Every structure is written in C-alpha cells, then in structure tokens.
Design a protein around this nucleic acid. Sequence first.
DNA 1: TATTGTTTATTT
DNA 2: AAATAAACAATA
Length: 77
Amino acid sequence: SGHIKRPMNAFMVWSKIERRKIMEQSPDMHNAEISKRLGKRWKMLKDSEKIPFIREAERLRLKHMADYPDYKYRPRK
DNA sequence: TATTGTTTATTT
DNA sequence: AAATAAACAATA
C-alpha cells in the first residue's frame, strides 16, 4: 500500500521469538495474556540478557534507513 | 482484544 | 522548555 512501517524495537524483536515459543509449547492461549506475560518477563530480564535483541533492533533500524532514507515517523489520529 | 520502546504531537 | 498523550511496530 506504500505505507512505511516503524522499525521493531528490542521488545518487539524479543516478543516475536518468545511469542512463537509460547505458541509452540502452549497453543490455544489468548494473545492478550501472552502480551501481559511477555511484558512481565521482559521487565524481569537483566539488561545484559537484553543485549542481543537491542542490537538486533538497531541492526534493523540501520536497514530501515538504507531502505527508506527519506522516512520520518508520522503518527496520525 | 495488550505489551515496551521510540517518536511525534499536544498540553502546560 | 517540560510534563503528558498518543500513535505504532509483530502477533491469535
């Protein structure tokens, strides 16, 4: 459609993988509960444990700049 | 139907 | 200038 999406931050990068894991082990589980539990877990994670994901987001961000150099975030009502 | 981090938009 | 609001990325 032409709309350029926001880069995934570290929490989104981690959430994708962990949501997939919870889905594989515990299917038939509602997405709101999964988000609540993922938020709690992420808040418990040590900063160092978060390093791979943070950097990964940054990597994606760099790619975003290369793919859409004229891009700026524009939230609209 | 919810979550965190990031950015812009709005109100103070 | 600074506190607050609000949009939004992936996903069942």
